Design a protein around this ligand. Structure first.
Ligand SMILES: Nc1ncnc2c1ncn2[C@@H]1O[C@H](COP(=O)(O)OP(=O)(O)OP(=O)(O)O)[C@@H](O)[C@H]1O
Length: 541
């Protein structure tokens, strides 16, 4: 019946539910509206997840798993994983198919089984609160996720025993919370998503027409080098040099010290959004030949702002990129929303306040906003929320190059994504051995008039006197907005395919110039295609 929304965070998870008209964030078993995303394997053969798993990490670096959201769906030879292999204290291994897996206590295990454990805790958190079993779910993912990662997010839920009703991306989920507030229609909003694992900026339009509120993403892009875990690194490296300057010991090579130090580094970081000072007292952190060593160093707040200013500045070019892709001016941008626990630090809000010239909205809970919005999607699916429409549509038509230099339209503008449709084409020459599929986007009928987005060949077409082999062309734009083009020659069984990425933005000012141009040029476009018909649509070499 009801469909729950889950914030799958790198660092914390959060559960919320629609209680009629107003959303409620549900507490986990400790009473916390957020649960750390950490998994631990104890000597006694049981697996800890959440706040219990976080606590035993300092003595169990190999069998305490955290930051598993950085491992799901990727190949081992990726640079950051090699970057990740060196810094992480637990064991990273390759799966038989080349996937990135982990191995704990001699058991080779994939991340989705591990992440499924948190959902079961979230599931049990929901089951204890509701007193009944729960099985239908909408799950969130980052906006920069590719084709392989989202499907893997669906599968992980199934290993946790869930039917995944919807995948939605995380910057979109947090915004649903904001739109419950009054006065949110007909505005342009920016979703700046800075988590533990990455930077994300999304541009979203909130429109309301004829009693229906519609939401459309105008731009998105991401940068995985600007996430909250990269900030913690910017402290682990420095802290060793101050002790080394005073007493000559390099801690980078001591994981047990590194395990307490990250915990000391992580918990204190929360404090500096509210606080101005504190003293780190971690007795017996290590020792050398002359006996025990003790940490006691006083340090305030300014130095950190000096240390991480470049990360904020390197996130700006992705912000600058987002506005061009959406085609908007600052004067079209109506509101600022903070999501994520790290925005409670004052300089980021000021750096944002200087940039936007207005204070970010203070009514969005940074630890809970993502979870609250995902719960709304469940109410839409059950009918609990009325007069709301998820808008995800194509700005321009998509197609392939055909006979005579003609574009044949396969997908008309403003069709909802995901989508798939089929059409039959044939061969142009006797005994034709090859075809070129030139993937094209635009509103003009001449193929030579569109932008090259890529092109591909399909071979193995059986020889025939022209037009007999039957080559079926499929374009698939999946729920991530990514276009999958596939081809199978039905008489032989062969299959080849390509993938075409989702756009980072939708530039309507330039698009609207092209559309008005197209209305003015309608008659010029017909005669060319009809005289190509004059000279089943055909594909060139
Ligand atoms: N009070 C606080 N002050 C400063 N930083 C905080 C606070 N609470 C949490 N953080 C930081 O915010 C980050 C987690 O934010 P959030 O839970 O929204 O991320 P996520 O959804 O887990 O990440 P991603 O979107 O990349 O998957 C962590 O770096 C954590 O250290």
């Amino acid at each position: 019946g009801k469909i729950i929304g889950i914030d799958l965070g790198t660092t914390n998870s959060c559960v919320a539910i629609m209680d009629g008209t107003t959303p409620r964030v549900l507490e986990n078993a400790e009473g916390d509206r957020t649960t750390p995303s950490i998994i631990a394997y104890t000597q006694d053969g049981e697996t800890l997840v959440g706040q219990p798993a976080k606590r035993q990490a300092v003595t169990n670096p190999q069998n305490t798993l955290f930051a598993i959201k950085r491992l799901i769906g990727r190949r081992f030879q990726d640079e950051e994983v090699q970057r990740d292999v060196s810094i992480m204290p637990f064991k990273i291994i390759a799966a038989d198919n080349g996937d990135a897996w982990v191995e704990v206590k001699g058991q080779k295990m994939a991340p989705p089984q591990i992440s499924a454990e948190v959902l079961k805790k979230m599931k049990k958190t929901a089951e204890d609160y509701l007193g009944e079993p729960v099985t239908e779910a909408v799950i969130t993912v980052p906006a920069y996720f590719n084709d392989a990662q989202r499907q893997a997010t669906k599968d992980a839920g199934r290993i946790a025993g869930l039917e995944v009703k919807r995948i939605i991306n995380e910057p979109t989920a947090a915004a649903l919370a904001y739109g419950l507030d009054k006065g949110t229609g007909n505005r342009t909003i920016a979703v700046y998503d800075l988590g533990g694992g990455a930077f994300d900026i999304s541009i979203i339009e909130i429109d309301e027409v004829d009693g229906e509120k519609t939401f459309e993403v105008l731009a998105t892009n991401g940068d995985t080098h600007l996430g909250g875990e990269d900030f913690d690194s910017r402290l682990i490296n420095y802290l060793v040099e101050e002790f080394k300057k005073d007493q000559g010991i390099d801690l980078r090579n001591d994981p047990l010290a590194m395990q307490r130090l990250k915990e000391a580094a992580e918990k204190a970081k929360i404090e500096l959004s509210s606080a101005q000072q504190t003293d780190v007292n971690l007795p017996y952190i290590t020792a050398d030949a002359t006996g025990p060593k003790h940490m006691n160093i006083k340090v305030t707040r300014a130095k950190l702002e000096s240390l991480v200013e470049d990360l904020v500045n390197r996130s700006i070019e992705p912000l600058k990129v987002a506005l061009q892709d959406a085609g908007l001016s600052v004067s079209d941008i109506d509101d600022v929303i903070l999501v994520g626990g790290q925005t409670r630090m004052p300089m980021v809000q000021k750096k944002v306040a200087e940039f936007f010239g207005k204070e970010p909205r203070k009514d969005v809970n940074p630890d809970e906003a993502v979870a609250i919005g995902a719960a709304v999607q469940g109410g839409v699916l059950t009918g609990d929320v009325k007069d709301v429409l998820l808008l995800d549509v194509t700005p321009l038509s998509l197609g392939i190059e055909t006979m005579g230099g003609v574009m044949t339209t396969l997908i008309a503008k403003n069709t909802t994504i995901p989508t798939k449709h089929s059409q039959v084409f044939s061969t142009a020459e006797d005994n034709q051995s090859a075809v070129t599929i030139h993937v094209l986007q635009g509103e003009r009928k001449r193929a030579a008039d569109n932008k090259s987005l890529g092109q591909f060949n399909l071979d193995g077409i059986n020889p025939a006197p022209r037009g007999m082999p039957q080559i079926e062309v499929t374009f698939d734009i999946d729920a991530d907005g990514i276009l999958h083009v596939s081809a199978k020659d039905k008489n032989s069984g062969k299959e080849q395919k390509i993938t075409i990425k989702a756009s980072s933005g939708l530039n309507e000012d330039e698009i609207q110039k092209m559309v008005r141009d197209a209305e003015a040029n309608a008659e010029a476009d017909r005669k060319f295609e009809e005289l190509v018909q004059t000279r089943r649509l055909l594909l060139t070499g």
